[PDB]
Structures are given as C-alpha cells and as structure tokens.
C-alpha cells in the first residue's frame, strides 16, 4: 500500500511542485547560427543532463517509488521524450514562436530547418505552447500533466495501483480548477482539453523518436549511453 492515495489534493500539488527538476542551461558558446551537427549536439547534451534530473524527479512523484523497479524502468523508457517535450513546451509559453530549450538557447522555426525533418516537429511543439498559453495553463496544472504522462504512457504496454494514482491526480486537477473559480461545467471541460493535448504530446514524441533514430543511423552526432538505452527501448 502506497502513500500517494492518502495525500490531500493540496499535499499532492506541494509534493509535485517541490519535486520539479531545475531549468538547465546549454553550453555557453555564442553561435546563433547552427549546422545540423551543431544544433543536435547541443540538444543531445542538454537532454542527457535533463534525463538525470527527470529520473530523480520521477522518484519524488507520489506513488512512483512504490512501483517495481522494472515498472519504474518501463514507464520512464516510454514517456521520457514526452516528459522532455511537455517541459520544453511549458518553458516556451511566454516565448511565442520560440522554443526555450534553455534560458541561453531559444530556437525558432528557421533554426529547426537546419536539421531535416525537425522543422515539422518544431511547428507541433510551438503549436502546443501556443495552446498552453491560450488556456492559461497554471504551473500546478503542468506538474499534474507531467506526472500523468509518466504513469499513463506505459501503463498498457505491460497496473491497478497506477490507475489509483492516476485517479488521484484527476481529483487533484479538479481541485485546482474549483479553486480558481471555474464552474462544474468549466471543470470537466478544461480537464478534457488538457488531457486531449496529451495525445498530441504522444504524437510529437513518436515523431521525435523516429527523428533521433534517424540521427543515430547517420552516426554523426554521438549519443550518450543513457540516451541510447532510452532510445533502444522503442525499437
């Protein structure tokens, strides 16, 4: 028996907010124009350092530590790029047209054209960021969506305890909307809109996963051993 189900909705928000990973920085060489290997090398280095914090963020998600080590590995292996992308989308909220990969690394659509096939994923990420901005996504809602992605994206690729925590985060999401003054009709409508965006985040992840599989086969930008493990888990 875990302890996530016993936590209050406010105690659920505080635990997720306190587990938030930091906003990392990219390498500080000022070269605004990028090549294909230059841009992918910076993102690969950044994503590799972000995975280490995500792994420790996952351990501090209520209910995740109560899972089997294998079940913990499975959920992170399938949702890792989704979690990175929804974090990238969230940081880019107050930067329309830009993707804030790091405070010292903002990229636009023209930047994604330096890597073939990545400008298409850029538009999807920028569209999701504009969608979060349109809905006035709160940070308390964002940390709930991240933990939902972690526990849901791989729950059918195996279970009852995971759905119990997923229902707990649902109660937590409703708690936030009822506190903001939204009516009952506005609660489940905003809840639906938020969860529907997760379908696009999954889509962007699968598209991004194939893009990284293409970069591996190009064998120009060297991937880290940890990234190769998270990448090989998708075949």
């Amino acid at each position: 028996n875990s302890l996530a189900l016993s936590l209050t909705a406010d105690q659920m928000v505080s635990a997720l907010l306190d587990a938030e990973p930091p906003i990392l920085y990219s390498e500080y060489d000022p070269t605004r124009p990028f090549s294909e290997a230059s841009m992918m090398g910076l993102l690969t280095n950044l994503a590799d350092r972000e995975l280490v914090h995500m792994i420790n963020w996952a351990k501090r998600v209520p209910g995740f530590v109560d899972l089997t080590l294998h079940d913990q590995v499975h959920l992170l292996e399938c949702a890792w790029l989704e979690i990175l992308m929804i974090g990238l989308v969230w940081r880019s909220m107050e930067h329309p047209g830009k993707l804030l990969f790091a405070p010292n690394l903002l990229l636009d659509r023209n930047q994604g054209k330096c890597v073939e096939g990545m400008v298409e994923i850029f538009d999807m990420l920028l569209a999701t960021s504009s969608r979060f901005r349109m809905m006035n996504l709160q940070g308390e809602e964002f940390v709930c969506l991240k933990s939902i992605i972690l526990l849901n994206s791989g729950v059918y690729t195996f279970k009852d305890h995971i759905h119990r925590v997923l229902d707990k985060i649902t109660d937590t999401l409703i708690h936030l909307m009822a506190k903001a003054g939204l009516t009952l009709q506005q609660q489940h409508q905003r809840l639906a809109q938020l969860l529907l965006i997760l379908s696009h985040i999954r889509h962007m992840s699968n598209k991004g996963m194939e893009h990284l599989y293409s970069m591996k086969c190009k064998n120009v930008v060297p991937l880290s051993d940890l990234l190769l493990e998270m990448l090989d888990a998708h075949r």
């Binding site: 280490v52 792994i55 996952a58 080590l69 913990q72 590995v73 992170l76 940890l226 493990e229 998270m230």
Partner: peptide, 10 residues
C-alpha cells in the same frame, strides 16, 4: 544491465 537501473536505485 541498464544504466537506468542504477540511476533509479541511487
């Protein structure tokens, strides 16, 4: 053996 195993135990 996976690196992800070690990072979850440590």
């Amino acid at each position: 053996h996976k690196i992800l195993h070690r990072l979850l135990q440590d």
